[PDB]
Amino acid sequence: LRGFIIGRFQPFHKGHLEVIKKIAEEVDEIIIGIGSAQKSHTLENPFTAGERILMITQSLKDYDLTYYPIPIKDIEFNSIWVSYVESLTPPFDIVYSGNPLVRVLFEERGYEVKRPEMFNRKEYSGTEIRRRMLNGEKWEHLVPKAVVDVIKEIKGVERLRKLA
Template identity: 60%
Template sequence: MNGNRGLLIGRMQPVHKGHINVIKDTLEEVDELIIGIGSADKSHTNSNPFTGGERILMLTKALRESNIDPSRYYIIPLEDISCNSLWVGHVKMLTPPFNKVYSGNSLVQQLFEEENIKVIQPPLFNRTEYSGTEVRKRILNNTNWEELVPPAVVKVINEIKGTQRIHKLNQKEISELI
């Protein structure tokens, strides 16, 4: 490693074991990692039920629980902006300098590549199970969601009554369709 700093962006709705595995793997390639909480301004919807602050809390506690050295990462909330062509500049303004980006999102990859920033697609860990969509679906169905997230995240979700929120948001969306 030669003093390099990477940027990893994810919505983390919620933080799950796949995120922690990707962060651990990425930290093997970089000296420091900026973890961008994407769509930090979005919350209380079916696809984005948790606030940026709640996701930062989940991630901070999960990384501590995994014994990941806090001097090696920064957690930065990244709000969406309505103009994609300006988004990379927006991200650069909010983060420490970085020389590579880790993202599995094709739009994020495209936007950074257009700015001549190296993009690496991180390996996905058991993507069928370790996805925010799967965690939220299992919460709605009251089935084994806890096995997909670190214990610290289970505690945060319970503390903020996250399962009740997801159920209420789903009811709200159904009633809007009727």
């Protein structure tokens, strides 16, 4: 029983960690699609795919969880997008998404789609995180320590302020 979720994870935060813990109550293994994999060094997408993969893996590695952090390019072709994801991932059974498009594409191919729970959405939000990194407000408590680590290694806050 595998599940799939997809996000940009810029960065992976504590709401992601919670929803993955919840989904790991329902399914044996979780595929973690890293969308917009080619997008990096922008204000919405500050981090590369390999940065994201490192954040995610370093966050989840001591949990008793089988997961697959897989980079998925933006391709501009919605009608083949489910097959493109399938090409790159282990077979899976359930998709967790609240996004109208991801839900329509997967349901027309016969998959089950479920809406995940949101946890503390006024704080646990890439958009809100990046906004605090830019304005000097105190964001480290919003993501896993492993992500803090990574963001320091690559100087990601500095990157984001330079790009602004």
